[PDB]
Scaffold this active site. Structure first.
Site, mmCIF file in Angstrom:
data_model
loop_
_atom_site.group_PDB
_atom_site.id
_atom_site.type_symbol
_atom_site.label_atom_id
_atom_site.label_comp_id
_atom_site.label_asym_id
_atom_site.label_seq_id
_atom_site.Cartn_x
_atom_site.Cartn_y
_atom_site.Cartn_z
ATOM 1 C CE1 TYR A 87 -1.486 3.422 -12.409
ATOM 2 C CE2 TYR A 87 -3.678 4.066 -13.030
ATOM 3 C CZ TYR A 87 -2.535 3.369 -13.276
ATOM 4 O OH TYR A 87 -2.439 2.603 -14.407
ATOM 5 C CD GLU A 88 2.369 2.945 -8.776
ATOM 6 O OE1 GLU A 88 2.052 3.635 -9.765
ATOM 7 O OE2 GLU A 88 2.583 1.718 -8.853
ATOM 8 C CB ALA A 89 -2.184 3.614 -2.898
#
Ligand SMILES: CCCCCCCCCCCCCCCCCC(=O)OC[C@H](CO[C@@H]1O[C@H](CO[C@H]2O[C@H](CO)[C@H](O)[C@H](O)[C@H]2O)[C@H](O)[C@H](O)[C@H]1O)OC(=O)CCCCCCCCCCCCCCCCC
Ligand SMILES: CCCCCCCCCCCCCCCCCC(=O)OC[C@H](CO[C@@H]1O[C@H](CO[C@H]2O[C@H](CO)[C@H](O)[C@H](O)[C@H]2O)[C@H](O)[C@H](O)[C@H]1O)OC(=O)CCCCCCCCCCCCCCCCC
Ligand SMILES: CCCCCCCCCCCCCCCCCC(=O)OC[C@H](CO[C@@H]1O[C@H](CO)[C@H](O)[C@H](O)[C@H]1O)OC(=O)CCCCCCCCCCCCCCCCC
Ligand SMILES: CCCCCCCCCCCCCCCCCC(=O)OC[C@H](CO[C@@H]1O[C@H](CO)[C@H](O)[C@H](O)[C@H]1O)OC(=O)CCCCCCCCCCCCCCCCC
Ligand SMILES: CCCCCCCCCCCCCCCC(=O)OC[C@H](CO[C@@H]1O[C@H](CS(=O)(=O)O)[C@@H](O)[C@H](O)[C@H]1O)OC(=O)CCCCCCCCCCCCCCC
Ligand SMILES: CCCCCCCCCCCCCCCC(=O)OC[C@H](CO[C@@H]1O[C@H](CS(=O)(=O)O)[C@@H](O)[C@H](O)[C@H]1O)OC(=O)CCCCCCCCCCCCCCC
Ligand SMILES: CCCCCCCCCCCCCCCCCC(=O)OC[C@H](CO)OC(=O)CCCCCCCCCCCCCCCCC
Lengths: 68, 85, 41, 96, 145, 278, 42, 189, 239, 33, 51
Positions: free
Chosen positions: E80-82
Site C-alpha cells: 500500500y505505502e509503496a
C-alpha cells in the site's frame, strides 16, 4: 594535638561530601514532619479564634518576609 | 523483531575492515574470511570484536558455520531480532 | 520559596480585610533581545 | 439490641441549622462522645439533609465545613474502634 | 509549516523522548520527523479509538489487537505505502516526500510525510491539475494492493 | 498581645515548617555517625564486623529516637490545659446532660429560671489485670496517613499500601513502560525535587459496568505506594460552580494549585477534566 | 491509555492468577515425603 | 516406565520455579561491563519495539521476584546492615569514585581473560595434533566462545583435553554447564 | 496474538501440574488412613507429571520428530556429565566418610586418645547416611541428604579452625594454637562443592513473615493473620 | 493439525472491527461455525 | 535509584526487623530485666514481687 584535630576534620569533611538529599529516596518509617510520625493533632481547648492571626505572622516571622 | 539489515551490514563491514587493515570498499558483502588476510585463529578475534561492538552473545554452532560477511551479518541480525523475547 | 513568600504575603493581606509584576530587562544573557533580530518586520 | 451496644441517634435538622460555624463543634463533640462511649452506633435520619452536593445554598464555609469535619472525624485520625455511622436516606444520588 | 514557538519547544521535548526510545542521547533530525509522525498518528487514533469502537491499534495483546501483527498483514501495508509513494513521485509538481514509514505507533496503516511550499499558492489557491493529481495518488494505494 | 498566646496551647500558634527545619538540621548533623563509628573502631580478629555494624545502626537510631521523645514530651498540655480539660469535662458532659434529661422530662431567661427551680424543688490501675485471672503504636504496622497540613488554623495521603502487583495489566501494556519507569527512576534517585512540574493526560474508556473500580486511581495510587510518596486527589466537578455568569470555583482551583506548590514532592490527581475543558 | 480490562477474558484470568500468586508463597515441596512412606511393613 | 498412564518416548524431568533473577537485558555473558545506560543493539530496532528495555526493568525490579529472593534468614538480616550502610550511610560522591575505579579494573580483567582464552585455543589446537597424530591443527570456535562466556565446568574442559589428546575429534564437545541454583539451608541462610 | 497465547498456555500448564501434585499428596494422606473408595490403585501416586500435560507433550513430541524427517570410553568420553539420577557430589561424600573413619581409627589407636576415633566414626556414619540419601536427587530425601552433609562438614571445619584437635596439644602456647590443616581443607572443599552444585531444596523453611512484609499485600485475611500472630490484633486496619 | 486451549466465544465491538477490516472470508466462516 | 528500588523490594522483613523489632522488643527488655536484677538487693519483695 594535630592528630586529635584531624579526626574531627575528617569526619566533618565526610559530612560535607553529602551536601543535601540528592541520592536519598523517600522512607515511610521516617517522614519529614515530626507531627505525622508522632501523631500530634490539636484538640478543642486552648483554641483562640484570633490565635490563627498570630499563627500567620509566626509563619511570616520565619518565611523571612520582612513585612510582618 | 523487525531489524534493519542495512545498518548491521554496514557496521559489520566496518569492523572487519578496521580489524584486518583492509580498506572498506575492498571487503565485499560476499568476501570470505581467509581471502581477506585472516587465518583460523583470527576469525575468532573478529567474532569477539563483533560481540564487543554489538554487545550481544553469538550462538556457537551458528558461529562454526560462518564463511561470508553476509552470514555473519545475518547471524548478528537474528540475535538482535530476538532480544526482548 | 518565592511562591511560599508571595502566598504568605497575599493571604495575610487578604485576611487583614497589586498585579504590578514588572520584570527587569537583562541584556548580558545570550537570549538578549536584539533590536533587529526580528524577521518579516 | 441483639448486637448488645449503646445506641445514639440524631436527625438531619438540628445540625443543618444556618447558625454559622456551629456545625463543626457539634460534630466534633458528638464524635468525641461516641469515641469515649464506644462501642456504639450512631443512627442519623435523612442524612441527605447535611450531605448535600457542592454548589448548594452556601458559600463553601458552612455546609462544606460541617461535612469536611464529618470527614476528618471519619478518616483523618481514625480511632473509631467499634463505632458505626448508620445513615438513613432515600435519595442516594444527592450525596457529595 | 504552520508552527509557532510553543509548538517548537514542545516538539523539542517530544523529540528528546523519541530519541530516547531508540537508545540515543543526542537529538537527530530523524527524531524530529519521528516526533511529527508520532503526534499525527496519536491524534488520529485518539479520534478513531474512543469510548469503545476501536479496532485500529495493533500491539495491545487484548482480543482486539494481535501481538506480532501477522506477516501477510505486513506485506499488504508495505505494498500500500509503496504504491502511494511511487505515484506521488512520478506526478509532475506534486509535493515533495520527506519520510515514508510503515506501522507508526503499531497501527495498521502507513504514513508519508510531505513537505510543501506555502508560497506557490498562498494558503488559498486550488487548480484543477492539482486536484486530479491528488485523486490519482489517493487511489494508487488500493490499486497496488 | 501576650494573653492570646499565654492562655492558648502551644502547637496551634507555632507553624510546622519550624519543626521541619529543626528536624532537617538535626538529621543533617548526625547523619554521619555510623561511618565514623565503623571507621574509628576498625583500625578471628574481624568476626566482630557484624557486631560493630549492628552497634552503628542501633546507636544512630537511638539518637533519632531521643530527639523524637524530647520533642514529643515538651509539647504535651501543661497545667492550664489539663485543668481546663478535666474541669470542663465535669462541667459539660455530666452536668449538662443531666440538665438536658431534666429539661426534656419537665418539658428566654425566664424559662431557664423555672428549669433551675422546678429541678431545685424535685432534686488501682493494676487490679483489673489480676481480677481478670483469679475469677499499641499502630505506626509500627500501619504507615498510611490521611492529613491536612501547611494550613491548619488539604487531605493529603501519606504512603498508600499499594504496589505494581495490584495492577498486573501494567505488565503487558507496552505504552506505559517508559513514562512510569522514568517517573520511578527519577523519584528513587532524588532528582525529582528539582525537575520542572508536568502535566499528563490519563484517558480511560467509558466504563459503566457493574464495577466500582477505576484504573486511573489504581495506577496512580500504585505509583504513590511503590515510591512511598504522598498524594493529593481532587475532582473537577467540585469547581464548575457558576452563578450570574461568575465562576467561583475557577479561582479556588488556582488557590489549591499554589497550595500543591508548597508541599513538594507530591503527586496531584485531578479527575474528569472535561468538566472544565469542553 | 488503558486497555479496558474488565470487558476482556484473558486479562481477567491472567490478572486474578498473577494477583493470587503474588499474595503469598504457596509452594510446598516438603509435603511429598508422604509419597515415600506408602509401603511400610510396620 | 514407572509412569502408569502416559509415557512419551522422552522421560519427564520435573520443572521447578527459578531461584535467581535473570541477567538483565543489557549485560553480556562475559566480564566486560555494559554501556551503562543504553545497549548498543537498541539502535538497530524500531522505536516501537524497544519497550522491552523498560519492561525488563519493571520485571527485575518489581514484578517477577522468585520468592526465593524474599526469604528471611539469619544471614540476610546482616547483609541488610551492609547494604543499608552502602546505600544510606555513604555519600553518593565516594560511591561514584569507587564505581569508576571498579569499572576500570573490570575492563582490565576482561582484557586479560580474552588473552588467556586465545592462548588456550592455541594450546588445544597444538595438542589435538599429538592426539589424532595427523593433519588436524584445528580447534572449534564453539569451544572458544563457550570458554569466553563461562559455559563449561572444569570437569568438562578436562574431559575435552583428554578426548583431544587421545582421539582428536575436535568437534566432540562436552554437553553444557547448567545454571547454579541459589543455595538455601534453613533459617540459617 | 501469538505472544499472549504463550502466556496463557504456560499459566494453564503450571496450574494443571500444581493440581495433580496436590491430588497425589491428598490421596496419599487419605489412603494411608483407610478411607479410599477401593477402586483406587495406589500405583497412580507414581505418575509424576499429569495425564493432560503428558498427552500434550507426547503429541507435540511425535509431531516434531515426524515432521523433521520429511577411566576412558572412546565411544562416549563424557560419561560422567550425564544424568544418572543421583547428586554429583555423591562419591566424594562416601570417600570422605571412609577417609574420616580410617584416619580416626588409625590415629586414635596409634596414640591412645579417645577423641579422634569418636569424631571420625561419628563423621563417617553421618556422611555415609547422607551419601545414601543422596542416591535419588529428585526426591525429598535427596535434598535432606545434602543438607545433612553440608552441616557435618561445616561443623568439622569449625571445630578444626576454632578449637583444634586434642591430640595435637603441645607445651608451647603459640604452637598449640588452632590453624587449618588437611582435613579442614577437605571439608571446606566439600561444603563449597555442595553449595556450587545444588542445595536449593526445601526452600519454604525460613523465619516467618513480619507485619512489614504484608504492608502492601493485596489480601486482607492474610495480613490480618500475620498481624494477629505477631501481637497486633487490635491495631485498626484503615486499609 | 502445543497446549490444549479453550476459547471464550465472546465477540466485542473492537473484535468485530478487527475481523471486518483485516481478515479474509474463511476467518469469518470459522467464527460463524 | 534503580538499585535502591530492587533492593527495597527484596528486604521488607529485614527492614521491619531493624526498624521496629530489634531494640524495642528484643534488646531493651533483656537489658532492663538484667539491669534491674543486678541492682535491687536479694529479697523477694524486690527481686520478684515489684518487678
Ligand atoms: C582534595 C579534593 C577534595 C576537595 C573538597 O572539597 O574536599 C571536601 C570534599 C567535599 O566536597 C564537596 O563535594 C560536594 C559533592 O557534591 C556532589 O555530590 C554530593 C553527593 O556526595 C551531592 O550529590 C551534591 O549535590 C553533588 O554536587 C560538592 O562538590 C561540595 O561543593 C564540596 O564541598 O569531600 C571529600 O573530598 C571527601 C572527604 C573524604 C575524607 C574521608
Ligand atoms: C585413609 C588414611 C587415613 C587418613 O588419611 O586420615 C587422616 C585424616 C582423617 O583423620 C581425621 O583426622 C582428624 C585429625 O586430623 C588432624 O590430625 C591428623 C593427625 O592427627 C593430620 O595431621 C590431619 O592433617 C590433621 O588435620 C581427626 O582425628 C578425625 O577424627 C580423623 O578422621 O585425613 C586426612 O589427613 C585428610 C585427607 C585429605 C584428603 C582429601
Ligand atoms: C573447586 C571446588 C570444587 C567444587 C567445584 C564444583 C564445580 C562444578 O560444577 O564441578 C563440575 C561437576 C559438577 O557438574 C555440574 O553438575 C550440576 C548438577 O547439579 C549441573 O549438571 C552442572 O551443569 C554440571 O556442571 O563436578 C563434579 O561432577 C564433581 C566434582 C567434585 C569437586 C569437588 C572436589 C573437592 C572434594 C574434595 C573432597 C575429597 C575428599 C575425599
Ligand atoms: C575424575 C573422577 C570423575 C570426576 C567426578 O567427580 O565424577 C563425578 C561424576 C558426576 O556425577 C554425575 O554428575 C552428573 C552431572 O550432572 C549428574 O549430576 C549425575 O547425576 C551424577 O551422577 O560422577 C561420576 O562419574 C562418579 C565417578 C567419580 C568417583 C570418584 C571417586 C572418588
Ligand atoms: C550470621 C551469618 C550466618 C551465615 C552462615 C554461613 C552462610 C554462608 C553464606 C551464605 C551463602 C551466600 C548466599 C548468597 O550468596 O545470597 C546472595 C547474597 C545477598 O543475599 C541476599 O540478598 C538479596 C537482596 S540484595 O542482593 O542484597 O539486593 C535477597 O534476595 C536475599 O534475601 C538475601 O539473602 O549476595 C552476597 O553478596 C553475599 C556475598 C557474601 C557471602 C560470603 C560471605 C561469607 C559469610
Ligand atoms: C562408618 C561409616 C563408613 C562409611 C562406609 C562407606 C564406604 C564407601 C566408600 C566408597 C568408595 C568411593 C569410591 C568408589 C569409586 C567407584 O565406585 O566408581 C564408580 C564408577 C562408576 O560411577 C557410577 O556410574 C554409574 C553409571 S555407569 O557405571 O558408568 O554405567 C552411575 O549410575 C553412577 O551415578 C556413577 O556414580 O566406576 C568407574 O567407571 C571407574 C572410574 C572412576 C574414576 C576413578 C575412581 C576409581 C578409584 C580411584 C582411587
Ligand atoms: C554501648 C556500650 C557497649 C558495652 C557493652 C555492655 C557491657 C556489658 C558487659 C557487662 C559484664 O561484664 O557482665 C558481667 C556482669 C557481672 O558482673 O554482668 C552484669 O550484671 C551486667 C549487666 C548490667 C547491664 C549493663 C547495662 C549496660 C548498658 C549501657 C549502655 C547504654 C547503652 C545505650 C546506647
Amino acid at each position: 594535638a594535630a592528630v586529635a584535630a584531624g579526626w574531627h576534620l575528617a569526619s566533618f569533611a565526610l559530612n560535607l561530601a553529602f551536601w543535601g538529599v540528592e541520592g536519598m529516596p523517600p522512607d515511610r518509617y521516617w517522614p519529614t514532619s515530626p507531627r505525622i510520625r508522632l501523631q500530634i493533632r490539636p484538640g478543642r481547648y486552648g483554641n483562640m479564634d484570633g490565635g490563627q492571626r498570630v499563627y500567620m505572622d509566626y509563619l511570616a516571622r520565619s518565611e523571612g518576609v520582612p513585612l510582618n | 523483531a523487525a531489524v534493519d539489515k542495512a545498518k548491521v551490514l554496514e557496521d559489520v563491514r566496518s569492523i572487519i575492515s578496521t580489524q584486518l587493515g583492509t580498506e572498506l570498499e575492498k571487503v565485499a558483502p560476499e568476501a570470505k574470511f581467509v581471502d581477506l588476510g585472516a587465518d583460523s585463529l583470527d576469525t575468532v578475534e573478529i567474532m569477539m570484536a563483533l560481540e564487543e561492538k554489538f554487545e550481544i552473545a553469538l550462538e556457537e554452532e551458528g558461529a562454526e558455520k560462518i564463511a561470508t560477511v553476509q552470514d555473519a551479518a545475518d547471524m548478528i541480525a537474528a540475535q538482535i531480532a530476538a532480544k526482548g523475547n | 520559596k518565592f511562591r511560599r513568600q508571595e502566598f504568605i504575603r497575599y493571604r495575610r493581606e487578604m485576611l487583614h480585610v497589586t498585579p504590578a509584576r514588572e520584570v527587569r530587562i537583562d541584556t548580558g544573557s545570550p537570549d538578549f533581545i536584539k533590536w533587529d533580530d526580528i524577521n518579516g518586520i | 439490641a441483639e448486637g448488645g451496644v449503646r445506641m445514639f441517634t440524631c436527625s438531619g435538622t438540628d445540625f443543618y441549622d444556618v447558625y454559622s460555624g456551629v456545625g463543626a463543634r457539634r460534630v466534633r463533640e458528638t464524635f468525641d462522645r461516641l469515641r469515649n462511649a464506644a462501642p456504639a452506633i450512631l443512627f442519623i435520619d435523612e442524612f441527605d439533609a447535611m450531605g448535600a452536593a457542592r454548589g448548594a445554598q452556601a458559600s463553601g464555609d458552612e455546609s462544606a465545613s460541617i461535612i469536611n469535619e464529618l470527614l476528618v472525624q471519619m478518616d483523618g485520625f481514625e480511632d473509631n474502634r467499634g463505632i458505626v455511622v448508620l445513615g438513613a436516606t432515600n435519595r442516594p444520588g444527592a450525596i457529595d | 509549516a504552520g508552527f509557532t514557538g510553543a509548538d517548537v519547544m514542545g516538539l523539542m521535548a517530544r523529540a528528546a523522548r523519541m530519541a530516547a526510545r531508540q537508545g540515543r542521547h543526542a537529538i537527530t533530525e530523524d527524531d524530529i520527523y519521528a516526533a511529527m509522525e508520532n503526534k499525527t498518528m496519536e491524534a488520529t487514533l485518539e479520534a478513531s479509538t474512543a469510548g469503545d469502537g476501536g479496532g485500529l491499534v495493533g500491539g495491545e495483546g487484548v482480543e482486539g489487537s494481535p501481538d506480532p501483527i501477522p506477516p501477510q498483514l505486513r506485506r499488504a501495508v508495505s505494498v500500500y505505502e509503496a504504491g502511494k509513494a511511487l505515484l506521488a513521485y512520478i506526478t509532475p509538481d506534486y509535493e515533495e516526500i520527506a519520510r515514508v514509514s510503515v506501522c507508526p505507533l503499531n497501527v495498521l496503516t502507513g504514513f508519508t510525510l510531505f513537505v510543501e511550499d506555502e508560497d506557490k499558492n498562498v494558503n488559498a489557491i486550488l487548480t484543477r491539475s492539482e486536484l486530479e493529481g491528488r485523486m490519482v495518488v489517493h487511489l494508487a494505494g488500493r490499486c497496488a494492493e | 498581645g501576650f494573653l492570646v498566646e499565654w492562655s492558648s496551647d502551644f502547637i496551634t500558634i507555632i507553624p510546622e515548617n519550624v519543626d521541619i527545619y529543626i528536624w532537617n538540621v538535626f538529621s543533617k548533623i548526625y547523619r554521619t555517625i555510623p561511618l565514623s563509628f565503623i571507621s574509628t573502631t576498625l583500625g578471628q580478629k574481624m568476626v566482630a564486623f557484624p557486631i560493630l555494624l549492628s552497634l552503628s545502626h542501633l546507636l544512630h537510631r537511638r539518637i533519632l529516637y531521643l530527639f523524637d521523645t524530647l520533642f514529643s514530651t515538651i509539647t504535651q498540655p501543661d497545667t492550664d490545659l489539663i485543668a481546663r480539660q478535666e474541669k470542663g469535662t465535669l462541667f459539660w458532659d455530666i452536668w449538662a446532660d443531666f440538665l438536658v434529661t431534666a429539661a426534656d422530662y419537665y418539658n428566654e431567661q425566664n424559662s431557664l429560671i423555672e428549669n433551675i427551680s422546678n429541678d431545685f424543688d424535685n432534686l488501682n490501675k493494676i487490679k483489673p489485670y489480676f481480677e481478670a485471672y483469679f475469677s499499641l503504636n499502630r505506626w509500627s504496622v500501619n504507615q498510611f496517613i490521611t492529613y491536612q497540613s501547611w494550613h491548619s488554623h488539604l487531605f493529603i495521603d501519606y504512603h498508600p499500601p499499594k504496589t505494581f502487583s495490584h495492577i498486573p495489566a501494567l505488565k503487558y501494556n507496552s505504552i506505559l513502560q517508559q513514562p512510569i519507569g522514568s517517573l520511578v527512576c527519577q523519584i528513587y534517585s532524588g532528582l525529582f525535587n528539582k525537575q520542572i512540574s508536568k502535566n499528563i493526560l490519563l484517558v480511560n474508556p467509558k466504563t459503566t459496568s457493574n464495577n466500582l473500580v477505576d484504573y486511573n486511581v489504581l495506577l496512580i495510587q500504585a505509583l504513590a505506594g511503590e515510591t512511598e510518596m504522598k498524594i493529593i486527589t481532587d475532582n473537577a466537578q467540585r469547581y464548575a460552580l457558576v452563578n450570574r455568569g461568575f465562576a467561583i470555583g475557577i479561582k479556588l482551583l488556582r488557590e489549591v494549585f499554589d497550595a500543591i506548590a508548597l508541599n513538594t514532592p507530591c503527586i496531584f490527581l485531578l479527575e474528569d477534566i472535561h468538566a472544565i475543558g469542553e | 491509555c488503558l486497555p479496558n480490562i474488565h470487558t476482556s477474558n484473558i486479562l481477567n484470568f491472567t490478572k486474578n492468577y498473577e494477583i493470587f500468586k503474588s499474595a503469598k508463597d504457596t509452594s510446598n515441596f516438603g509435603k511429598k515425603i508422604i509419597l515415600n512412606e506408602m509401603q511400610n511393613l510396620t | 516406565t514407572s509412569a502408569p498412564f502416559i509415557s512419551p518416548m522422552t522421560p519427564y524431568v520435573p520443572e521447578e520455579e527459578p531461584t535467581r533473577t535473570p541477567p538483565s537485558i543489557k549485560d553480556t555473558g562475559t566480564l566486560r561491563p555494559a554501556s551503562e545506560w543504553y545497549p548498543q543493539w537498541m539502535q538497530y530496532r524500531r522505536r516501537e519495539d524497544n519497550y522491552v528495555f523498560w519492561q525488563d526493568k519493571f520485571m527485575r525490579c518489581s514484578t517477577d521476584i522468585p520468592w526465593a529472593e524474599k526469604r528471611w534468614t539469619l544471614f540476610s538480616t546482616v547483609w541488610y546492615l551492609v547494604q543499608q550502610l552502602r546505600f544510606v550511610g555513604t555519600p553518593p560522591a565516594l560511591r561514584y569514585v569507587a564505581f569508576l575505579g571498579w569499572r576500570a579494573l573490570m575492563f582490565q580483567v576482561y582484557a586479560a581473560h580474552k588473552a588467556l582464552v586465545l592462548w588456550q585455543c592455541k594450546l588445544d589446537a597444538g595438542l589435538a595434533r599429538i592426539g589424532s597424530g595427523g593433519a588436524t591443527a584445528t580447534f572449534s570456535k564453539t569451544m572458544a566462545l563457550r570458554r569466553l562466556h563461562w559455559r563449561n565446568s572444569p570437569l568438562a574442559e578436562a574431559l575435552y583435553a583428554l578426548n583431544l589428546y587421545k582421539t582428536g575429534r575436535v568437534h566432540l564437545l562436552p554437553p553444557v554447564a547448567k545454571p547454579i541454583p541459589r543455595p538455601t539451608f534453613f533459617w540459617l541462610f | 496474538g501469538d505472544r499472549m497465547s504463550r502466556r496463557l498456555e504456560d499459566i494453564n500448564k503450571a496450574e494443571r501440574q500444581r493440581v495433580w501434585d496436590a491430588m497425589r499428596v491428598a490421596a496419599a494422606h487419605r489412603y494411608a488412613s483407610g478411607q479410599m473408595p477401593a477402586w483406587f490403585d495406589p500405583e497412580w501416586l507414581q505418575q509424576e507429571e499429569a495425564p493432560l500435560n503428558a498427552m500434550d507433550r507426547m503429541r507435540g513430541e511425535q509431531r516434531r520428530i515426524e515432521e523433521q524427517q520429511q577411566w576412558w570410553r572412546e565411544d562416549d568420553p563424557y560419561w560422567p556429565l550425564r544424568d544418572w539420577g543421583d547428586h554429583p557430589m555423591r562419591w566424594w561424600t562416601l570417600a570422605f566418610a571412609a577417609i574420616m573413619a580410617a584416619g580416626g581409627l588409625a590415629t586414635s589407636v596409634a596414640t591412645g586418645y579417645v577423641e579422634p576415633v569418636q569424631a571420625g566414626l561419628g563423621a563417617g556414619a553421618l556422611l555415609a547416611l547422607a551419601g545414601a540419601a543422596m542416591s535419588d536427587a529428585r526426591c525429598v530425601p535427596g535434598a535432606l541428604g545434602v543438607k545433612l552433609a553440608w552441616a557435618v562438614c561445616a561443623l568439622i571445619v569449625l571445630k578444626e579452625v576454632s578449637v583444634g584437635w586434642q591430640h595435637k596439644r603441645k607445651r608451647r602456647l603459640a604452637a598449640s594454637a588452632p590453624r587449618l590443616e588437611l582435613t579442614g581443607l577437605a571439608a571446606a572443599a566439600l561444603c563449597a562443592g555442595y553449595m556450587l552444585t545444588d542445595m536449593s531444596g526445601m526452600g519454604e523453611v525460613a523465619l516467618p513473615p513480619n507485619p512489614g512484609a504484608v504492608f502492601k499485600s493485596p489480601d486482607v485475611a492474610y495480613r490480618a493473620s500475620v498481624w494477629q500472630k505477631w501481637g497486633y490484633g487490635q491495631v485498626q486496619m484503615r486499609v | 493439525q502445543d497446549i490444549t486451549i479453550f476459547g471464550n466465544d465472546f465477540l466485542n465491538l473492537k473484535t468485530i472491527n478487527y475481523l471486518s477490516l483485516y481478515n479474509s472470508k474463511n476467518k469469518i466462516l470459522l467464527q460463524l461455525m | 535509584g534503580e538499585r535502591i528500588w530492587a533492593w527495597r523490594n527484596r528486604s521488607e522483613n529485614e527492614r521491619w526487623f531493624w526498624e521496629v523489632f530489634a531494640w524495642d522488643r528484643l534488646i531493651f527488655p533483656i537489658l532492663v530485666i538484667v539491669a534491674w536484677e543486678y541492682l535491687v538487693p536479694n529479697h523477694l519483695v524486690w527481686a520478684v514481687l515489684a518487678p
